[PDB]
Design a protein around this ligand. Structure first.
Ligand code: 5GK
Ligand code: 5GK
Ligand code: CA
Lengths: 614, 614
């Protein structure tokens, strides 16, 4: 958790004590090549002693890039280079690593010439990909050399038996490490160099078709981490051009790793299922934007709006089935205490025998069957994915996959409330209408006009109104309790705005939004400490809190106005792919033209053409 | 429609199969001039075979700019250059075209030297001016040469019999093609070169007075497409200067093609009758801004505001004629069921015999005659123009040409409702007053103060309030149905805010805008599921939806604040010209001074003078 930082830093301090109380090893921290020549020549002053992190005297000579003190330890001890560190923080790191990390060294001549091992995996905990190590350099020695942009070490290291195809404990190869580097441009140049040494290809999956232990090619990994620049360079192999015609030209894109091939994941699946921001920016690039906007124009909006009309037809025969709820006059003759009760219907229990009530038995049997169809296409998607996917990817957009569960759950209650004839049946029917109709708004994303205005709401309910509601809640029960002990010494027959304490909570909340009338009788003197504390209420309620909330809502609008126009194009892809998965193969043709008729293979293709002025 | 793209791209793939299964023709795609020399020398290996798009082996040698493979096909086949392509996509395109499109070639030496035809019209469907071809290059070979900015082909091609004055199937000449190019600056230079080769002028309409099949000169076409830069260069011939005097100077403008000459269209007519945005920017240029602002200052505002005072005097004697509507006491003695009906007048039918009611017979005969005058000056403008002109140019400004039809239509109803004495006569009179008075706002454009604030409304009613009204409509009948099944088990004598379902639709809509009081009785316990769902209503109604709508309305204001100040100057020209067309010649003098007194001709003129510091 947190004390792991408190144990890591003490290792760094403990090194400086072991570098201090050690005679030859402090001479290794400096040059001291006259003294370290003499400090070695003794009876029992062995070089295998280790500091805090389990480190030899050669490493310290390397870690402070002292070449003269390095070679004397090699000349006096030939076994010393075969020696990795043995801490739990650093582990398996040899002396070849550090001279490579310092990116400019002639010691890499010497350590290679004394037959160092170029396959020492450095799987210590200071090298795993986590947001606590500030580097991610991989494990192998040539993996470090590429990672710090030093070609002259890479060409030297590959010449003496370095294996390109060596993966890591994370599973990634040399080239996956190059994608998620922060210094993006210098990786793209040297990516071309590392690809060249793959020749003869080992007659199988040559270099950049191999997945990792998490299961991605280098091309797909460029998508998810959001490296925009490397995604440009990886399309250069994948596309190949056609005829050119003045300033007009046309190309073909490979497309074999974009759309859904089978049950395997696609790239467009991986883009929308991440929490990052830079990754979703990749949609506007030239071989993917054409694929999306063609996919939603000819097979999108028809099969979305026809899903829209069915669902609007569903609730309009649920609401019509609702308001014909059966009743009867009441038979208990104005029971528990009178004049402060008014209800007079007390729900009918089982009488359907009517030539009219048969029609509701159709309409009830419409919406209950509809509640079963909702639960059969979401509950199989809960168990197939993780449990934290629906609270998981909800920020892209996911309240609507929670509401339409709760809509189906409440309709499934009101038939259990009907089959045994309970009393309080107006509770789930009330939630059914408010949660039902607000899921019409799920279809308010396949339209340009009332599109991104929906996303502006979701980014504000889980936004400034959640921010405002707390400081609304603290004041609203502050003054209400201060109102309640004023009018408690009063008869509520006239100006009984609040007689009971769970009404002054409600009668102040209505008053805070100015949707009720403000308490006045004008006929009898309502008490004095009302009229001072009501005026002091209305200043910090109507004149301050209510319309500060429009000021910060106006300010928070334009500072996300460019982000929401990306959120919409992100949401429209996620509607397309989710619509793609459920529709069968008898509908929904695959996008783009095919092979097997043109001498291209089994892979599909897409073309596009444009003007490239000069 | 859309599958025409699905048939176009398959032609491009089918070419790559025909380039593949053809031995000499693939050798034409590369150079292969050693092999193609031998591939021709056979018995039956003729060169007239055609690929997918009906194309010969010379074209493929041209389309991949292979000069060596081009000349061997000419040397072995002299007839081969006389050969256009025969697809439906490309049609009539010869081998001279492609070497010209590639803009740098020595094959245009050779194809001309073997007597190619420089008048092969390429009227295939991949060359028509439509928003699906990314080019518009015209049809003729020198038309292509100018279009890609290569003078050295133009001077070569004009020297061997090229005809400048050759129009196209669209009707446009060489020079109309130069105006609507996208690379604007390079057209303006070479426009001067193409004008030079018109000499001897063919003693009639020399080069840039000829219209097209759509009917425009090059000067007027520069207006409508909105090419600002070419409009500067075309005024250089048209104006001619006068005396210069230090930093002060004065010029004259030609003006013979700006104002309305006769029944023919003017340029100012063509500017306001387009849907584009760049074209309406041309108004601020120096020979047109002076013409407008002088035209509206001395013959504008008088004949606009006098139209304003007549119309305000019209409705103020319609409203005065309205509220003296005749009545009587009622004679049916409180019919169909009592206490839930209140009306007590039941309109008088034909009695006008009164010394006072004669005055209304004047006032009724004022406004009915006024309704006839409205219909006699718009219905002749429907049939003379297209039917989709009033829904057509309405975005510039046109609701007011629809309302004042509907005003006249409703007043014409209420006399038919009077001549046969129907009952429900308050319906068209009510629409007459609300639609009548809102057409006073048509005159709110000839004033600086309450000017562009009108256009801010039209860009918002057909804007964010149309955006807001849908998500207002979905919630407003959501909660209302949820309110209706709560108070259905209640006697509406006390807190009968809504008893019937087409009142809870209305009583919630009033409540959503907080213009009613909020339901409270404080005396009898109104039910529990009200008070929870009312508070959850008011948060996403008064605190969220209502005042988000002011936040996005504040944000959408300043991002069109510069556009509306162009819309106003656009609207004021359209008021001037529409006022110009209807007023006779006995009024409204033509703008600017005349000829025939100064040795200038029959054309009119305008002058202006300014300072040109250094
Ligand atoms: O008695 C009750 C108690 C709670 C409620 C809850 N309603 C239901 C609808 N939304 C909820 C659920 C959906 C979610 C939401 C609403 C509107 C628009 C969006 C979005 F995402 F489209 F912006 C999301 C938040 C509150 C407002 C309150 C009604 N009635
Ligand atoms: O019972 C009804 C039913 C419909 C109506 C329609 N009115 C009529 C007037 N405008 C309409 C028509 C004009 C148009 C408009 C109004 C004001 C200002 C402008 C503009 F263009 F100047 F901004 C345009 C839109 C709604 C509001 C509603 C009234 N009464
Ligand atoms: Ca009130």
């Amino acid at each position: 958790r947190e004390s792991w930082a408190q144990s890591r830093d003490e290792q760094n301090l403990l090194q400086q004590k072991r570098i201090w109380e050690s005679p030859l090893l402090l001479a290794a921290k400096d040059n001291d090549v006259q003294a370290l020549n003499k400090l070695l020549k003794y009876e029992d002053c062995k070089v295998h002693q280790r500091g805090a992190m389990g480190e030899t005297a050669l490493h310290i000579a390397a870690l402070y890039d002292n070449l003269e003190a390095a070679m004397v330890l090699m000349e006096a001890a030939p076994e010393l280079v075969f020696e990795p560190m043995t801490s739990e923080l650093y582990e398996g790191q040899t002396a070849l690593h550090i001279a490579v990390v310092n990116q400019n060294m002639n010691l890499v001549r010497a350590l290679l010439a004394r037959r160092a091992s170029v396959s020492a995996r450095a799987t210590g905990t200071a090298f795993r990909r986590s947001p606590c190590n500030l580097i991610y350099f991989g494990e192998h020695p040539l993996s470090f050399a590429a990672c710090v942009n030093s070609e002259e070490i890479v060409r030297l290291l590959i010449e003496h038996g370095a294996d390109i195809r060596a993966q890591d404990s994370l599973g990634n190869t040399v080239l996956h490490i190059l994608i998620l580097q922060p210094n993006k441009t210098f990786a793209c140049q040297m990516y071309n160099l590392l690809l060249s040494y793959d020749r003869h290809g080992d007659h199988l999956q040559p270099l950049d078709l191999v997945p990792n232990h998490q299961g991605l090619t280098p091309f797909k990994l460029a998508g998810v981490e959001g490296n925009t620049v490397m995604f440009q360079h990886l399309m250069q192999k994948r596309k190949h051009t056609q005829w050119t015609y003045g300033p007009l030209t046309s190309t073909l894109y490979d497309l074999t790793e974009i759309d859904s091939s089978g049950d395997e994941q696609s790239l467009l699946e991986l883009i929308i299922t991440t929490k990052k921001r830079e990754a979703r920016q990749i949609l506007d690039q030239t071989p993917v934007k054409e694929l999306v906007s063609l996919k939603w124009k000819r097979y999108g909006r028809p099969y979305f709006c026809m899903l829209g009309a069915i669902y609007l037809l569903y609730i309009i025969c649920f609401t019509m089935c609702c308001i014909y709820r059966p009743l009867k006059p009441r038979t208990n003759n104005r029971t528990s205490p009178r004049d402060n009760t008014l209800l007079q219907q007390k729900l009918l229990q089982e009488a359907y025998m009517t030539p009219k009530d048969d029609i509701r038995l159709v309409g009830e049997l419409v919406t209950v069957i509809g509640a079963i169809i909702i639960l059969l296409v979401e509950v199989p998607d809960i168990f197939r994915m993780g449990v934290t996917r629906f609270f998981g990817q909800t920020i892209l957009g996911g309240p609507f996959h929670v509401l339409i569960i709760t809509y189906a759950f409440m309709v499934l209650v009101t038939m259990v409330m009907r089959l045994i004839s309970a009393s309080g049946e107006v509770v789930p029917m009330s939630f059914a209408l408010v949660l039902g109709w607000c899921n019409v708004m799920y279809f308010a994303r396949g339209f340009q006009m009332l599109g991104p205005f929906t996303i502006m709401i979701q980014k504000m309910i889980f936004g400034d109104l959640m921010r405002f509601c707390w400081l609304m809640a603290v004041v609203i029960l502050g003054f209400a309790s201060a109102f309640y002990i004023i009018f408690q010494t009063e008869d509520p027959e006239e100006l009984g705005h609040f007689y009971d304490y769970p009404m002054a909570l409600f009668s102040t909340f209505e008053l805070f939004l100015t949707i009720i009338d403000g308490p006045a009788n004008y006929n009898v003197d309502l008490p004095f400490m009302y009229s001072i504390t009501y005026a002091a209420f209305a200043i910090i309620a109507t004149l301050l809190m209510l319309n500060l909330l429009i000021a910060m809502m106006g300010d928070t609008h334009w500072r996300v106005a460019h982000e929401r126009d990306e959120l919409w194009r992100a949401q429209i892809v996620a509607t397309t792919v989710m619509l793609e998965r459920k529709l069968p193969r008898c509908l929904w043709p695959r996008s783009g033209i095919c092979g097997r008729e043109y001498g291209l293979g089994d892979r599909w293709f897409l073309r596009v053409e444009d003007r490239q002025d000069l």
